[PDB]
Amino acid sequence: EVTPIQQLFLIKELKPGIARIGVIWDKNAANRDEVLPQLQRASAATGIKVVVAEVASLQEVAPQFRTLLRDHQVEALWVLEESGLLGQAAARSFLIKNATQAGMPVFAPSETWLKEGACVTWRKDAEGIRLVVNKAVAEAMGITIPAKYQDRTAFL
Ligand SMILES: [Hg+2]
């Protein structure tokens, strides 16, 4: 498992200057009590504002995404897991479609998202953390791979 503070620090280097990121979090996902204050401390360690929009059903996904954009002006979407609601194609395809229309990058929990249009995911290696990047989409959305990570970055 790549930890949230590890993902946010990777996000800071992949999208330099990012200031506001939005998280769609399934309220039913386990470890909610551990993950949400985890996100806020990663936010304080990075200087990136992390707005968390929780969803309990598929119906809540669209209003919560739109609220993140209209009221919080997030510049990217961050999805941490997909064990329940966020693993259903209806929620994934919406989040990917509309983030793509808004020109914002999506940091995703598995390669399935990158095959559908998301920008970046990650996996823990013997060597630490390796990046997986959809190049053509990530390039177009302002993602830059630091040379310190060019070696340890696969391109879907
Ligand atoms: Hg994207």
Residue numbers in the entry: 27 to 182
Could you give the paper's own sentences about this structure?
A typical SBP consists of two α/β domains, which are connected by a hinge region. To understand their molecular functions, we performed a crystallographic study of single domain SBP from Rhodothermus marinus (RmSBP). The overall structure of RmSBP showed the single α/β fold, which is identical with that previous reported, although the molecular flexibility was distinct.
The crystal of RmSBP soaked with HgCl2 (RmSBP-Hg) belongs to the monoclinic P21 space group with the unit cell parameters a = 92.84, b = 97.86, c = 101.98 Å, and β = 90°, containing two RmSBP molecules in the asymmetric unit, which is a new crystal form and diffracted up to 2.0 Å. The two RmSBP-Hg molecules in the asymmetric unit clearly showed an electron density map for building all amino acids from Glu27 to Leu182. The crystal structure of RmSBP-Hg showed a strong positive Fo–Fc electron density (>7 sigma) on the Cys145 in the loop between the α5-helix and β5-stand, which surrounds the α5-and α6-helices. Hg2+ interacted with Cys145 and a water molecule at an average distance of 2.57 and 2.27 Å, respectively. Hg2+ was surrounded by Ile122, Thr126, Val132, Val163, and Met167 residues. In the RmSBP-Hg-A molecule, Hg2+ was buried by neighboring amino acids, but in the surface structure of the RmSBP-Hg-B molecule, the conformations of the amino acids around Hg2+ were slightly different, and Hg2+ was observed through the hole in the surface structure. The Cys145 of RmSBP, where Hg2+ bound, was located on the side of the α/β domain, which is different from the previously expected substrate-binding site.
